[PDB]
């Protein structure tokens, strides 16, 4: 049981940084921009078997796009990453949700803020809206203090599979 | 080849992709016009798979726009000095897939759209809209047809310059009506006809400031509220937020002979995507007035307000809204999780909103629900009496809001060892929030600190 997932957000909200915290469980400190896409595999064992997310970690900056909407052709599921100690990167969300909508057509879709470890938060939680707009699920997210870490995979699992009741 | 290598784009060997992205980018730089001729021939033609037929309509729609405007305007100067016999290949041959492709977001219409952006506003491709308003209407339409292309209008009118196609809003308006239309028979044209709407309605400015044409907008979107279809019904909501969003001011003559049953109506509903609109609609007229009042806010002047026009529909609408939010808090299943986004969760935002949105006309309304449940058998009712008890903390001045430490507190200590762990977390939120609150209600020092000091152990 395998599905296509396609992580998408601006670049340097910590997209690729998050794929291998989950991955191997290292932080990467540096950003080093994705070109175009990094598909890697990621394996959870739940109460009904191994489920596998193929993520296609995309770029996020427009010149390392690649193929940037030719990756989302049969895409299952998507999350849509932001920075919340970057307003920018909150503002280009719905953006990106169109990008999806006008390639993917009832696909479950989770937005995340990351990096809410860090002190003071530029986007806070009373800003964020889109998820209320577009009847979205929506997480704090961190991949350096693992906040949250397994939510989006967990939603997207439940939603998939549909079993509400399906656990890591 | 070029169909093999459009088939390899969903391949997950980076190497493979590389190598189909270097062929692509290639081709399109070596020779642009017949490179876009033969990926509008594998995007019309129904034999190819779905992939190949995506990828091609992407390459297409990617080589005509980009996130960057300066981009952008390059790519549509490169497609316009592209030969006109060549680019009028492209366009028929993008035309003619429309009603071809047998999965639901098509990729044509994204291709109809970039090439419109660029050819419209230098008036290139005038049998554009009259085409495509006639393959909605046409009786003989397949669905396929009428989706396609009620997808196309709508892109149209969410990606070019207002300015470029006013001269025939009136008759993309009709369009989108006709497949928004209560007699249309397919949900899924319906559906398309909604969307197109919802992408459009920043177009349409000029025609909602025509008080007729306004008339028949609101008219099909309340119908469209109605349809059986739970998708079309979504959608339909999420119009009316929009609208309350960009056309607060117009709204007056609606809310009330309508707009008014029809949210109640959605938020009491058991379907959650449902319900969760109908309350957003809400908590969206709620983050309109808080604005209008932020910038009524100016008794440091400069004329009258702006042209701000707070009507105050949540504080006429608050005591109906609550009893219905308040009950929406129990909707609370074994496998839920805190943080779902449904309607419980949306109702304890909207419920805040009032909070500070009419500061104290909430408390009155809360309260006997507090009352009547914090001590309920139920776990449900028992949490949502916490929850709602914790959401009017935000607004009402601390001197009303001294209604936690008599009668609240102690049982909202007691509370926090409940058997239901939901209810103990919502009780631990509630006390945490009201920490908050108490400096504001100070009175008392050296009572107020070691309330403070023991409660934070909690
Ligand atoms: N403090 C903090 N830093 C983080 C977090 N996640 C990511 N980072 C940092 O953010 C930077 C960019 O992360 P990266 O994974 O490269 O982002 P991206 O979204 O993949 N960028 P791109 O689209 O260009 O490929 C790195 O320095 C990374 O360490 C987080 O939760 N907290
Ligand atoms: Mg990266």
């Known amino acids: 049981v395998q599905f296509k997932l396609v992580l998408v957000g601006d670049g340097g909200t910590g997209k690729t940084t998050f794929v291998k915290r989950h991955l191997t469980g290292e932080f990467e400190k540096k950003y080093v921009a994705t070109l175009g896409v990094e598909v890697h595999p990621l394996v959870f064992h739940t109460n009904r078997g191994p489920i596998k997310f193929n993520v296609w970690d995309t770029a996020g900056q427009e010149k390392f796009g690649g193929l940037r909407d030719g990756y989302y052709i049969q895409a299952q599921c998507a999350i849509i990453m932001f920075d919340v100690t970057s307003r ?81 | 080849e070029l169909i093999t290598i459009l088939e390899k784009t969903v391949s997950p060997d980076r190497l493979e992709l590389e190598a189909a992205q270097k062929f692509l980018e290639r081709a399109a730089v070596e020779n ?90 230098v008036n290139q491709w005038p049998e554009l809209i009259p085409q495509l308003v006639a393959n909605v209407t046409n009786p003989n339409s397949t669905e396929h047809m009428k989706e396609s292309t009620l997808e196309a209008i709508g892109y149209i009118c969410q990606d070019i310059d207002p300015e470029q196609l006013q001269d025939k809003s009136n008759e993309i308006l009709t369009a989108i009506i006709q497949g928004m239309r209560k007699e249309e028979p397919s949900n899924n044209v319906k559906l398309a006809a909604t969307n197109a709407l919802l992408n459009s309605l920043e177009f349409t400015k000029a025609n909602f400031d025509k008080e007729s044409e306004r008339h028949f907008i609101m008219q099909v979107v309340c119908e469209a509220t109605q349809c059986p279809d739970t998708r079309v019904r979504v959608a339909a909501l999420q119009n009316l937020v929009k609208i309350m969003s960009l056309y607060y001011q117009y709204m007056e003559t609606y809310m009330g002979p309508a707009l008014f ?71 609370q299943d074994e496998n839920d999780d805190d943080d779902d986004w449904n309607p419980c969760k949306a109702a304890g935002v909207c419920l805040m909103l009032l909070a500070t949105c009419c500061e104290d006309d909430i408390v009155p309304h809360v309260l006997p629900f507090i009352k009547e449940h914090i001590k309920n058998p139920d776990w449900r009712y028992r949490d949502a009496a916490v929850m709602a008890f914790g959401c009017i903390l935000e607004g009402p001045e601390p001197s009303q809001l001294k209604p936690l430490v008599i009668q609240a507190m102690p049982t909202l200590i007691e509370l926090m060892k409940d058997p239901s762990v939901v209810v103990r977390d919502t009780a631990a939120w509630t006390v945490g929030r009201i920490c908050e609150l108490l400096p504001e209600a100070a009175i008392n020092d050296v009572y107020l600190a070691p309330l403070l000091q023991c409660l934070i152990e909690g």
């Open chain 1, 88 to 168: 920018v990167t909150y503002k280009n969300v719905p953006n990106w949700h169109r990008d999806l909508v006008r390639v993917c057509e009832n696909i479950p879709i989770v937005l995340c803020g990351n990096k809410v470890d860090i002190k003071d938060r530029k986007v806070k939680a009373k800003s964020i809206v889109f998820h209320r707009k577009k009847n979205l699920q929506y997480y704090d997210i961190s991949a350096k203090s693992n906040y949250n870490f397994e939510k989006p995979f967990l939603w997207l699992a439940r939603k998939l599979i549909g079993d509400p009741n399906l656990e890591f």
């Open chain 2, 32 to 121: 642009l016009p017949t490179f876009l001729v033969e990926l509008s021939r594998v995007l019309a033609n129904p034999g190819n798979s779905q992939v190949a037929r995506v990828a091609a309509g992407l390459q297409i729609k990617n080589s005509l726009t980009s996130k960057d405007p300066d981009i952008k305007a390059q790519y549509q100067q490169r497609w316009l000095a592209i030969d006109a016999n060549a680019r009028r290949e492209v366009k028929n041959y993008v035309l003619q897939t429309l009603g071809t492709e047998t999965y639901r977001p098509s990729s044509a219409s994204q291709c109809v759209a970039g090439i419109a952006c660029a050819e419209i506003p």
């Open chain 2, 261 to 331: 049953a029809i949210t109640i109506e959605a938020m009491k509903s058991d379907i959650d995507e449902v319900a969760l609109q109908g309350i957003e609609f809400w908590s969206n007229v709620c983050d309109e007035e808080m604005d209008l009042a932020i910038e009524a806010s100016e008794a440091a002047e400069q004329g009258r307000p702006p042209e701000h026009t707070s009507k105050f529909y949540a504080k006429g609408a608050l005591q109906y809204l609550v009893p219905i939010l308040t009950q929406t808090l129990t909707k």
